[PDB]
Design a protein around this nucleic acid. Structure first.
Ligand SMILES: C[S@@+](CC[C@H](N)C(=O)[O-])C[C@H]1O[C@@H](n2cnc3c(N)ncnc32)[C@H](O)[C@@H]1O
Length: 374
DNA sequence: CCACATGGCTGAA
DNA sequence: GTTCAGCGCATGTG
């Protein structure tokens, strides 16, 4: 009676999609399987392998000769020299393992109907808002190409049963809304019916304000077969959680010297964020706030002001640590310790990958609504 | 027009 | 090439 769920994670990062599925699998009587992934960012791949692998033992290895399109910064491709630098290191073994055991295809432009797995149960993806226009472009154009290709070569039953997009709130702005709607029409042409959700992490057992757009799609014949109905997730409001609830005790944190800066009382906004400004601190508004641990915090970003989240504690004002950032995205302590134990990812890079991820319990809630046939 | 609220990019080293 | 401290406005609601 156990149902094997084959998942394919495009732009997988550290695998918040896979983590969410593993977290609910037992309660669904599911067995989650890596059908494939696409991730080219070296530090995300290393971290993905650290978190999700079972019995992987790193060692010095030659990099597989076809692992050629990867990135050290996540934005730009690594040079022929940078590839040489990874070759014959422990780090290479992580990339080789992702290829061999998780079927990482690395670069979306290299994905086609010849290597895209058949009978995928859940296909997850994303794209930047610029991709909506020149007709699509960039990563979304590649997703569209792949869907076109598999549509023509696969039977309908071999095409992914469910698609899930995550994106930022700007996807529904005045400038992007219409073009996003045209993408949904295209998914329709491909045989998928979809539902757009705007969800805030704070409503899914988290102490973080984080509004994300999700487009859950179901293949239209599978909809008929299962009798699946979309759930109204935008009305869900679980009990609030405070920053206080995830903080880790330590006698050796670094506290910021803010003695030079004038401040005010804390004020709570409608979003349950409780903050106070620092005057003459910077000219960058988002950098100038200290947050109260009895409320929720701001959206964790990969870089910049919202990756340096100042909280007021009894011991002083400090940044949320990398561990606390993992917990803030609803990964567990053990996930963080596995990444830390690689000794390959710096503290700022760990925050960077956390800031790019998705709060895990939002995904648990979405995935809890899926229906599969026996 | 106003007040209020909220979330990456890049050049110097 | 890497790294991150320094830096502001885009996109809203009311
Ligand atoms: C915002 S993230 C998503 C992270 C993911 N949701 C998670 O669970 O951590 C988007 C990811 O897509 C990756 N990416 C960008 N261009 C890519 C390409 N051509 N091929 C593969 N991955 C790419 C980036 O490295 C980045 O980690």
């Amino acid at each position: 009676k156990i149902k094997v769920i084959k998942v394919f994670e495009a732009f997988a990062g550290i695998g918040s999609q896979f983590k969410a599925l593993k977290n609910i699998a037992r309660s669904k009587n599911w067995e989650i399987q890596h059908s494939g992934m696409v991730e080219w960012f070296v530090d995300a791949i290393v971290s993905y392998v650290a978190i999700h692998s079972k019995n992987f033992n790193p060692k010095i290895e030659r990099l597989d000769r076809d692992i050629l399109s990867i990135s050290n910064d996540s934005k730009m491709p690594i040079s022929e020299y940078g590839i040489k630098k990874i070759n014959n290191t422990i780090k290479a073994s992580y990339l080789n393992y992702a290829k061999k055991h998780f079927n990482n295809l690395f670069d979306i432009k290299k994905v086609n109907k010849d290597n895209f797995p058949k009978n995928i149960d859940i296909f997850t993806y994303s794209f930047p808002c610029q991709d909506l226009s020149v007709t699509r472009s960039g990563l979304l154009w590649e997703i569209e190409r792949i869907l076109e290709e598999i549509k023509n070569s696969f039977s309908k039953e071999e095409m992914p049963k469910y698609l899930l997009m995550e994106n930022v709130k700007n996807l529904l702005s005045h400038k992007n809304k219409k073009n996003y709607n045209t993408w949904l029409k295209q998914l329709e042409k491909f045989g998928y019916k979809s539902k757009t959700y705007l969800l805030n992490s704070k409503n899914f057992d988290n102490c973080q304000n984080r509004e994300r757009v999700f487009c859950l799609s179901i293949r239209d014949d599978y909809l008929e077969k299962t009798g699946f109905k979309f759930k109204e997730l935008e009305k869900v409001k679980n009990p609030p959680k405070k920053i206080k609830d995830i903080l880790v005790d330590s006698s050796n944190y670094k506290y910021l010297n803010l003695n030079k800066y004038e401040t005010t009382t804390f004020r709570e906004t409608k979003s349950n964020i409780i903050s106070r400004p620092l005057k003459n601190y910077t000219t960058f508004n988002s950098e100038n706030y200290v947050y109260n641990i009895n409320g929720i915090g701001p959206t964790l970003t990969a870089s910049g002001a919202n990756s340096r989240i100042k909280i007021e504690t009894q011991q002083g004002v400090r940044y949320l640590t990398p561990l606390e950032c993992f917990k803030y995205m609803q990964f567990d302590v053990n996930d963080f310790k596995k990444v830390q134990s690689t000794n390959l990812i710096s503290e700022n890079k760990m925050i960077y990958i956390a800031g790019n991820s998705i709060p895990v319990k939002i995904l648990e809630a979405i995935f809890n609504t899926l229906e599969f046939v026996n």
